[model samples]
Target chain A: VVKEVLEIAEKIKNMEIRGAGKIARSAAYALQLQAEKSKATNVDEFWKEMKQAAKILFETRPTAVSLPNALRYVMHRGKIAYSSGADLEQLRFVIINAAKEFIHNSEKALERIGEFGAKRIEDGDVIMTHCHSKAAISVMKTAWEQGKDIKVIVTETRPKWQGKITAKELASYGIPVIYVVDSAARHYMKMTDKVVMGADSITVNGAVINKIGTALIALTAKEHRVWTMIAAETYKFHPETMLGQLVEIEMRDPTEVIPEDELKTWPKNIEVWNPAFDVTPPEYVDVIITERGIIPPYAAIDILREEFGWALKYTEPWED
Target chain B: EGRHMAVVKEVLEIAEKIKNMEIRGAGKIARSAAYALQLQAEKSKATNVDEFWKEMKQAAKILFETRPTAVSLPNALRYVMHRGKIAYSSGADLEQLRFVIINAAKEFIHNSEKALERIGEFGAKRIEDGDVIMTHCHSKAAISVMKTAWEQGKDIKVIVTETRPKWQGKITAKELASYGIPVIYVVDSAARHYMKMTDKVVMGADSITVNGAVINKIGTALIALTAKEHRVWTMIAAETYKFHPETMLGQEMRDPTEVIPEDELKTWPKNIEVWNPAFDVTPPEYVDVIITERGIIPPYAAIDILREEFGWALKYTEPWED
Candidate 1:
């Protein structure tokens, strides 16, 4: 069980297993495997080992909300077994069922979010996106599948060029795609009808934190009166943010921005900032399309509570 | 060969440099062209006044044709030609004619440089300490303002857009970084995002129209538009001469090759068209102020400065109009 947990942690740490949904599902699966394979003879030992596995997986990606969220759900089930004084075998069965249930619900959330987001797109709508979002691309594919003649404008999201991945995916779905450099967002925003994006995590303040350049596109869309929407799942909602915890933006390797050859050309004193994500204030977003339904920024807490069973009315204590 | 003909050959060489962009910048081009003529007048072997005048006119014609769209080139030629015309009407001998032409060219070059310095000082006054300034493309006038502000002991940060296809913003960034002013270099698409935190948007104008439209680098209009949308003040730093007298008539169009190189076109679809206008027009409504050597004026007040400095006759003179 410990070996399986370490292997999954290695894959998540190396980014072999990526995406918010996939990472969350993988973390849950690892917990289930850990539970089924544990050789603990007692309930206390079983709970202790289960927590050890969760702690190991949680450290794989600190900024990702899904990893922590998945661990929190699995741990919540473990507590239920602990309080009930279940035997070791029954405790293992409860935890495994909880992980499986989380994965099943996650897959259902993605499919429903796609259907809801696709309804926002009218025929002949011109949609623009930055970076690659599995949920966002699913919306584009679903819209095209519904016979909506939608076109996509993808920004070759710099440093990583995730926009190209999104462009190729949309193109595979037969949606017309126009690839542009990130700087051309304003020039092209004048023609864009909607800007739909995926989120790394939606904070308690309803800010959408995604790829570095997503905020710029949303800001331009706001200036142009173009509707900006975010297609995200409930698992991406960071409930801990309700207690005023700030989302830490991850800064990646500078070499991703400019290669060593290019860096040598720049002045030695010059500094390079390669932030992986930026926070977009909720005001710039028109609506956030979740698996439950389209929700206004102000109504995010309600959806988090209603769909994910978060206690939206009460803020979580700052201390654990 | 006659001494004047030798001077004319040197003038043609300078013109070729200007055309090839080996000699760039309006001030440098204007100064070099004027200096060439000064050398022509000093070295002319023409014994008669008519011969001296003819040689000078021939050199001016060659220099003007190198980059006809350059306002400074024509202005340089006209300054020297106007002085030559005066010397001709006065019945001056070849020696006297040469002296006047030489003096006029020298004076024009001196005045042009002084005008840029004055613009820098005036534009600097508008920048406050601890202000974040966003700029696009490479502009000597824009750099001058930032440098002046720095020299005044006001700490300022600059956000430079990597003006694409050419990346002129790299030059701006390196320069500002040299001055110990922190710079955030970003791609052109990210201009609007940085604008939210920017105190002002300052750029250089290629030309400003009589009715207040600014003709500048291709991305100026986009920057001005975004700045206006954010309610950020947009200032254009330029010498008064950059104000186009004929802009009220219409703007001159530029080439498209600057946007996309011909070599890159082969990979693109055959039907795809690239529109790379060298300049874009920003209407006066989006501009907060136009900083010049004279003073900062509202966009609508541009023509008054032109009328006062250039005079109606010279301002309306269409040298190319037959």
Candidate 2:
């Protein structure tokens, strides 16, 4: 059980298990296994093992809110089950049950998010998106399943080209997709009905850090008088940001921009800057769609605290 | 005596290079052709006045045929030929005619270079230190402004578009980088994306109409429109000779193959229509100012300057009439 927990942590760190929600769910299942297969005979040993397992998974990815959020929920239930004087076997049942329930709730939350996001889309609307997001794709898929005739414009988000995955997914669902180069965002924004995008993290102030070019799209949309919509899940909100924790933007390698050989073609003094993401302030964004419902950017903190019971109290670091 | 024949041969060679586009740019092409004409007068084998006139006409015709659409080309040939005709009608000797025509060519080249430098001085003042300027295509006039600013030791940054089909922006980027100016190279479609950060848009004109519209590279109109929407200033740096007086009658679009080369289209569907225009027209309202050797003027005021300096009918007639 301990070996499996460590293996899962390694996978999460290597990004083999990608996506915020997916990483969280995998970590919870690993902990549930630790409880089921533990050789510890006493309550103290069982509790000690669970704590160690949770710490391993929590350290896998620091930027991901869902990882720590999942651990907190499962650990909270474990503490309750143990304080009630339950046996070690019964406590194991409690931990597995909590893990299963969290997974089930996560799937349900994604489905509900899709429905609420789909409500905002009207027939014959042209939506433009950048990069790939499971939550954003769910909303798009649901809108198509709802029988609305809509077209999607996808930017071939450079360096990684995550938009290609988005284009393929949309095309498979029978949604019309127009794949364009990243530079064509403003050029095609004039024909778009609304700009729908996904978020990596939504700050307390409602700033969204997504793909590197999302800010450009939002700025252009504002100039063109088009509404910008961000579809995200509640767990995607960072509680640490409430305490003024700034999101760390990752910078990828220069090779992603141009190969080493091609770099020789440019002047030796030339520098290539390849930033992974850029922040878009709340003013440029009109609304953020979540599992609870669609709300304005200013209302994000209220929804997180009221619906998910998340607030500034959870901003502290985890300690065994 | 043999050296005279060698100089005429050099003139014809430069004309061939101009026709093949081995030598480009309106100012550069005009300067070379004018200098070639002067060489013809000095190296001519003709001993009589009549033979001298015939040889000069032949040489002018050869240079003019190289590139007919170029505004400066015919302007240069006609300017020298006009002076030669006056000297001949006054019954000037062969030696006097040579001196007259050679001096005209030399003066034209000198004035053209001076006009570009004056344009640089005027344009450089508009650029403040730490300002970000975006440019489309390759323009010596635009580069002159940048070079002038750099020479003043004012720090600045530049954004250059990889002007499609020809990618002339690469040359512009290289030139700017060599001057120690920071440059961000972007594709043509990325123009609007970077416009939010850009303070000004500087472009060069292939020709300017009486309506004050600028005829430049195909993607220039797109940049101008975006700049207008963003409320950024747009400037055009061009010489006075580029002012197309004939455009007052009407304008014609150039060939489309420049957008999509013929070899690339052979494998494509036959019904595909490609609209590859070499230049697009941006109306005067979109332009904030047009910088010329005469000084900056509004687009609508272009015709006034043309009339005041060159006169209404000056060089307005068809070049082919001769």
Candidate 3:
């Protein structure tokens, strides 16, 4: 019954559904599909199957908080209906609607993020971003479309070089882009007026988990006194982290840094550690722009509380 | 003319190699320039003093013209020629002049190697047990220090930056890991991510300015700058010969191909200018200390080193003597 759901989960794990918003929306859609396709004749059995499907999707990308956040939002809606004495069909219909609502909200999240984040960029300022993020790019695109005179310094996000996509995308919108190797981020920071990037996950303590090179860029930005901002949707706030869970940073294969043909030639003792993400402490982050509103990274807990409220327990949709 | 042509051929061969970068590293370039001059003095068939002096100076000019960016190449030729001139002016015979140049060449080469070992000893002393050391690019002198610490059983761990463009840090990773030490190899972009955990930042230099600013691989300044923010002890393992007593700010901007190869750039869009500075200058403030063969000194003490080491060569060597 979870055949389609499993196929989407495989793509999410393989990074075919890559962007944070895309990943979250895909999770919501997968659960929505499960709700519509569930053949369970009883509410207890159907709810159990829903948990099974959400768990499968949640395990796909462990570091991304949005996936679970979307799952929690959709699953909590179904859970509320279950406790309200909904019959099997009504519960399934309710879960499906919640998933549809989340997917729609995720789209508007970027628009809201654009409006909120565009205010931070002054005229003729140079903005910087690491990796390609929809929310972050929306901010820059909106600012550019608003006739704000500005430019961007895009990092050559390594291993995958996603920043190339960012460079091309921003240039498509008539926004000037300055491309640099990831190592040159600090060198270019001196000229950058503000750095706006995306967050993969924002912990309850206001720390940001992002692409591996982000923390380094923030460090230099903080030293250079450049304003550092993170553009994220409210769904990116990791509620599990509030309950003492550390984000499990996904370590990629060594071949991402060095090709296998060359890496194999080196002695077996030489090892490589390619961490996909690194945490930027709140001190380095000056502000965080979410779909809800502009906020400081230190105020991340307030965001989590506002979004999850008493439903924080529903964050673990895969569990009993 | 026959003998002069033969000397020209040999000097040009060395010059070509320097231009081709077959001889890498400032230390090797210096020693090669010194040896090339020594060869000129040894093989000169000039029957008189004027011809002998002209040949040596000509050889120096040839080698010097090959790599203007290599401070050591010019400095090495200057030292050898200065010593030879002193001997010639003192009434030394043709044979005596040859001996003097060879002696200077030999002396510089020996000093260069010994200084590396001395730097290793002094640098290793600063490393403590269980220190998480970070390194960028590949510096033989830097490796000497870290390897020395490992041999002494300091239980240190190393993080290697896969320095882009050249990726010399792979060699560093292999060098340290081959010695049975644990290594965490990462991309140059990850330097700041791991900088928080690194106890010390140790690396080598291509050219150090009079004010103690370090010129090295492109990412070095970034590493040192981040190191200072983390309050990590930043140490440079540089040979005294690598000092650039002349000037700074004229460092070369290398071929854009290094940053984006032909194959990749072709398929890509146009009008995007690529900036590839071969090396970067790390201000002395970012550097806590510099470990040289002579001794470890603060970055601000660079003048003391130049004043003490290059006082004679600075005055005596006619770098462009016709």
Per lDDT, what order, best first?
Answer: 3, 1, 2
Recovered native contacts in candidate 1, as a fraction? 0.08
lDDT of 2 at A274: 61
For candidate 3, list the clashing residue pairs, or say none: none
- How well is each residue in A90-136 modelled by candidate 2, as lDDT tens digits? 88888899888877777777788788889988989999898887777
Q: How far is candidate 1 from the true structure (C-alpha RMSD, Å)?
A: 6.3
In model 3, which regions exceed 4 Å deviation?
A1-19, A22-64, A71-103, A240-248, A310-320, B1-24, B32-66, B77-106, B129-131, B153-155, B178-182, B246-248, B312-322
Give the Å error, residue A116, model 1. 3.0
In the order shown, the chain A TM-scores of the predictions are 0.84, 0.84, 0.82
lDDT tens digits by residue: candidate 1, A1-320: 47999999989999898878889999999999998888898887788888788888888887777887787777666765777888888889988998999899887877888899999999999999989988888888888899999888887787676865776667766778776656567667878999999998887768888887787778768878999999998778776553365444666776776677886887654566566777788988999988778888777766556444456464221112
Candidate 2: global Cα-lDDT? 0.76
RMSD of each: 6.3, 8.0, 5.7
Candidate 1 to truth, TM? 0.75
1 or 3, which is superior by TM-score? 3
DockQ-based CAPRI category assigned to the predicted complex of candidate 1: incorrect
Candidate 3, residues A51-147: lDDT per residue as tens digits?
Answer: 9998898888776778788888888778778878999999999989998998898889989999999998888999989999888999999998889
